[PDB]
Amino acid sequence: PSSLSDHRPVIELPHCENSEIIIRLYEMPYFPMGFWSRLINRLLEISPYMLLRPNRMYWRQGIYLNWSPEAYCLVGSEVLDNHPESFLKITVPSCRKGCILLGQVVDHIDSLMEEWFPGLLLLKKWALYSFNDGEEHQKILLDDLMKKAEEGDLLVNPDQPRLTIPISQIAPDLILADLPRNIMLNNDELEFEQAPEFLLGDGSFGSVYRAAYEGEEVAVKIFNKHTSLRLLRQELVVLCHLHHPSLISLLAAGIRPRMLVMELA
Amino acid sequence: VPYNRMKLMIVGNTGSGKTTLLQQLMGIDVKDWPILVLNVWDFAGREEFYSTHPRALYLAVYDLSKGQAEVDAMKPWLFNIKARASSSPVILVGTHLDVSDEKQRKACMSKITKELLNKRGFPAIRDYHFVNATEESDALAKLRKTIINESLNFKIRDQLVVGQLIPDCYVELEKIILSERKNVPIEFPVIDRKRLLQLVRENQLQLDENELPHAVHFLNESGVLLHFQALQLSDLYFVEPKWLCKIMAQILTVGIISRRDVEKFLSKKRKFPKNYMSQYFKLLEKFQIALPIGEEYLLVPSSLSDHRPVIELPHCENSEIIIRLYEMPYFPMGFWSRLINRLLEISPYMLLRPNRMYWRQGIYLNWSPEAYCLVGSEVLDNHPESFLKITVPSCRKGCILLGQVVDHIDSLMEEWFPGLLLLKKWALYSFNDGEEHQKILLDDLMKKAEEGDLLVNPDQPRLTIPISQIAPDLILADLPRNIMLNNDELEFEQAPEFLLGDGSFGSVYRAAYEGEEVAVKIFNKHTSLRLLRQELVVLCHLHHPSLISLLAAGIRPRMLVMELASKGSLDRLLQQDKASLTRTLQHRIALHVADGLRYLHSAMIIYRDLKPHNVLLFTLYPNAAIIAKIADYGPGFRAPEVARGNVIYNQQADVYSFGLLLYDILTTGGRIVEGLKFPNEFDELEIQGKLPDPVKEYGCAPWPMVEKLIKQCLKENPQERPTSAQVFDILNSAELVCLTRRILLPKNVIVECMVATHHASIWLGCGHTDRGQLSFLDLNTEGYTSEEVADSRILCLALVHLPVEKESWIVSGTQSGTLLVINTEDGKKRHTLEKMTDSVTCLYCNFLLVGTADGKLAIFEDKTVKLKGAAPLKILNIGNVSTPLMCLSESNVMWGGCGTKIFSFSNDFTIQKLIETRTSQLFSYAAFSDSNIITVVVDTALYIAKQNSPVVEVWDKKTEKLCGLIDCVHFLREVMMSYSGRVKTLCLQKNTALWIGTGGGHILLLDLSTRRLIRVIYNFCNSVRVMMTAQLGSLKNVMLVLGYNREIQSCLTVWDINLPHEVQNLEKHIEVRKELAEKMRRTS
Amino acid sequence: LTRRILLPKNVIVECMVATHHASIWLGCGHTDRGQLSFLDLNTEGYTSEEVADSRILCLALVHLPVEKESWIVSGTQSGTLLVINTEDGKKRHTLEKMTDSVTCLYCNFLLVGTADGKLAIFEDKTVKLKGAAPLKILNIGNVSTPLMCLSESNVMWGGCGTKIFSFSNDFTIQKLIETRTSQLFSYAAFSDSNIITVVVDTALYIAKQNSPVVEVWDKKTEKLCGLIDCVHFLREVMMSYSGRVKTLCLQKNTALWIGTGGGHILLLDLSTRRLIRVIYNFCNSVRVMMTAQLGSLKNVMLVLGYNREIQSCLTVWDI
């Protein structure tokens, strides 16, 4: 109900320690009233089962949702002392179900950034993290995190190498661990040469080649430095629940190469 | 102080004129009469109080113009008076003399000189008068003088017997309370605030355990307030007499009435809490105002029609029915309402509901033409004595009904109308249908029952009757088939060598029955039959595995054949064979006793006698279905509460007694039992409740859980003590059995690592401070010390044992990367080995393996480490600056964790395989898979726990493949942010038990052969830090679990390594006996 | 045949014997003196003549085809035995008076059961003598324990008090079963009772006085084989029906007829112990039942009872 105030109820949560949760921040000074009405309309679509209608508590500029002690998802606006630039904050527990809830939410937020703010892409994406429970969190610009995601290593403290953090915890929606089990790319089965002899076609995202995934010729979409990672999962969203004999099915994704594997015949 | 107040009880029948008598002299109208202040209670109407809740003088008032008939009517009143206060004075006053000819006066005069003044059974009427009218009279002047002088004489009589006079001195504080209770203004005068009122008046009679009970006792006897002591509205609900009497009397007058309609009226009359209303109804029962019929109805005995409804019984010929008569001089007041309450529960099927009818003076139950029952009053001409008649049809069900009826009648009289036990019992019979019945006393039939003969007509031998038809309750024909005595099985001699014991009931002999050892109770000329049947009633309907059952009864020689214990009583075992008394046996005994108590308490039976002398053992074999039983269900070992001799027994008394039994079991020496030999200290000790620490005082091996159970059980306050149901639940625990020790560490001490000495003490690290501090725990004395030994914080400890060189050293790896090596036999021998290039993350040792934070593995030669500054044999680079080594396991090939890879080593320290486990992310969740390995357990598969994972990975070392996942969250998800589900440590036992510690205070026991949850051990502490497997100095294997208990508290818990087995075995044990309980109860 | 034979109003019968060759002798229970009545089944005729001072307790037929004569022995309350020739009612003989009253008779030789538990045995042709002494006398019970059931079905089963006897060819007690041990089953008031009727085939069927059940005993091991619950069967039927057993008759095809004290007669199959059929409301109270053949040799059941105005009724029931 849009008639509600921006009240934020004192709800005791599970997963109170820093390592118990995932925190994603979206910075922008102001999100023109109506933004959160559109946001909640798209937030009231979240359901990890699709890959239950819990005691959600709408906060006008965000929502509680609740889900379960095991997996929950809080989304809403925030502001800090001496930090007038407002921001969105997402809190899910550090687990796959939380990752799923997060992944669906961040896609809804970005689709809103495309919808409510066409062409704006402000909207700074930060991974909030800590090397020790009870300590102060630090922020990673996801652009730099993606530079490190390419490496596939942990966040390594250069001054104290003894402190390292899994990138997948830092940003669960960066590495596709929340996919339906049947489409996680088996890197030991994707016999993809990437040579011109395998070229089938192309597109704005990059190029289409062929590969012997699990011994079968499949089509492969290489997101060749044309907004990779992002477009890849957005396509996966379209592919999810897309089931018809006349259509090209998904034969596993592949976030590490940014190469979607599709039906070829 | 010299209390000068006395009660005046005025009794008589309605219309006597007794109130106006009182008026001139000066349910129940209560007023003071200062003369000496009398508390006058005028029983105006039929106030059952004289029987429902009976320093007083009785004034018996009757109408002389009615005559001798009225005199006889007063016999029940006199009986009742004698029955509760035979020593109290009675003044008999005839009224209406001004309308009664002296003919009646002298007729009644002679009547009382012949039948009351000189007749036993009545409370020796002290004096008497006749009064013309309540206008005034010389007779009344004399009566006043008589009342005064006689009440003085009475108190003199009390001084002669009781020791108290009309100025007897009572504690002044009780007198004060009387005044405090006088001053009470409450809308619904029910008092609980009395505790506060005690505190208002300073605090007098401060002995709540003794003086308080005496004050209350006094307050009822003195006529001040009302306790109602098994009601819920009893102890904490003191009620104004005026309301109790008024409201209940009114409701009677406001005959079957539904409960609900009564509730409706009551809720408008006086808005009582529904809780109080449930008690209200219970009070109506206890005060004989109304009896429960169905759960929705009340009988309301008073006012029931007194015109016995026309009932035509089936069966007419003499031989078709059985008749029993009870001759009485008069029925006691309330006799019938009490009798009815008992008879309503009769049923020939307890081993469709009956068409019940009520006469006030009788009950008719129908059921079926096959079996029905009529009980009611009948009177014959020329036979002043009133009497009961019981009629049942002559068949087995009819017999069963008869047995129940006569058992209730005799029990009624024993409890409520003793003195009669008069009650001439007659049986009716005839030798030919169509003729008249003949009477015979049951005593004579018992004489014939002993002969076993037919009743034979002394004039004509051709006419005989099979005794059973006349009296099927003299011969035990109403027994369950299961307990009829088979005379071809029972084999006994009654010879001296078989005598097991005796008592007021007769004697007990050892015998054989169906090839088994049994005990035979013989009622050898001790008011038998009645005692026999009482025991039969109690024994039947109690069918629990922990009780001694009945193995057939037989009237022919009047016997009860019961189970004989094989190993004898506990007391003997305690003093004769401690070797049998193992920890396992002891626990099982405690369970079996607790069950018996739970059962008997649910059966509303207070045992009142739990001592070692009453516990019987049927086999010392620890793993048996039934081991201990409680004898004879239905000294200096008393609860301090009941030890006062001024309270009533209840379940809490038994619980306290149980606790003492448990204490006695704990100390197998029976040390407090040995204390009995000096009873002057023993009985008082228990009264004091100041028992010594069973461990420290007697040298008894620790047994926590039980130790606190005893403390919880033996509390001074009855309301604080645990219920017997709860006691059992506590005893029903594998944790109870297997927890052996618990040592708390000093406040604000944090231990991050442990090394037990395999030979009885533990070396402890210390992560509380930021300084290399080494602590030490002595398990033999629970001693504790600590000293700073290094600069940076100690991370890992390891024991170097050189039995060849006869020495051993503690290797302390720390944050600085140094290795401090200290001789266990000499604290002065401290030295440092070659410093590592990074901190030490783990140690293992033969070669001393040092795993450092930079992924480097140093290997030191076995003895070489003795030298200061010694270098390692060789050094390997496994990981890197960001991938530290964290685990060296071995169960002679090494396995271990390095970042996210699993390595393995040969005896030449060469790498035999680097298994990258990152690929497990295809299953589970990538942030769990991608995390540093904490520990590696090596069995027939590898068990991997990673940092902050909730999932344990199972790997096939033979093919290097993921073979399964263990979801710890799932297991605790099944259990109803302490539930983090984070895996802390893994220990593995070669009997398939897998021990998994976690973030919260839980330990999971899994079955390696099936990957299944055996049990969740929990509410251990705040968080589990480390777990070790270690052999004690007794060679017993235990788990050493060190945890946090945030108030930074930490502690060491020692568990019996066989916990997994105890969990399963106990569960089985409990279930088997559960089934047996149902088996027994169902047979009946 | 089911012939409903009615006798004169207030006629009461205490004993019955039929000539197995078509007529029945009946004892006049309604009188105060031994009167002997006689029913002619061929013409439905009925008469009576005085035979004794005391009443008749039991009648029996003595037949000597070698002598071409037959007699009715009258066992009376007096203990005397009057022998009455049926070919000549005036030709009467006398057997030695018993020590007590005669409860039962069975006739080669005549067995005489008495109230004091004795069994006199009179040699067949002593029936022609007056003041004749018995062949042999057995001491079975006593004054408190009467002998009452003589059931040959070639040895004699004896019902005396609570014990079952079996007598040899020379009157030796072959077997003795005290049935008081049956109290473990049933109910003591029934178990402990005088035995009235004993029926024997493969097992013994014991009807005790005032019992609603029949005991079944194993003649081969002397053990209780089972119980027949008559009142149960009447319970199955949808103070007139007390269920007390009055008489047991048994045909070789296991047809056990149980006459009760009411108007019902229970026919039961002893090969399965299963109720076959109840005769409903035969009379108000069945007294005795006898298996016999008519003049046509038709096998009928002589069901004698009362329709209480005592209306004695004999139905010549169709077997």
Ligand SMILES: Nc1nc2c(ncn2[C@@H]2O[C@H](COP(=O)(O)OP(=O)(O)O)[C@@H](O)[C@H]2O)c(=O)[nH]1
């Ligand atoms: N003639 C006469 N009648 C009396 C005497 N005392 C009482 N009664 C009558 O009895 C009545 C009092 O009865 P009460 O005491 O209220 O009834 P109770 O409590 O049921 O006995 C009054 O009517 C009196 O006049 C008396 O001395 N003489």
Ligand SMILES: [Mg+2]
């Ligand atoms: Mg009055």
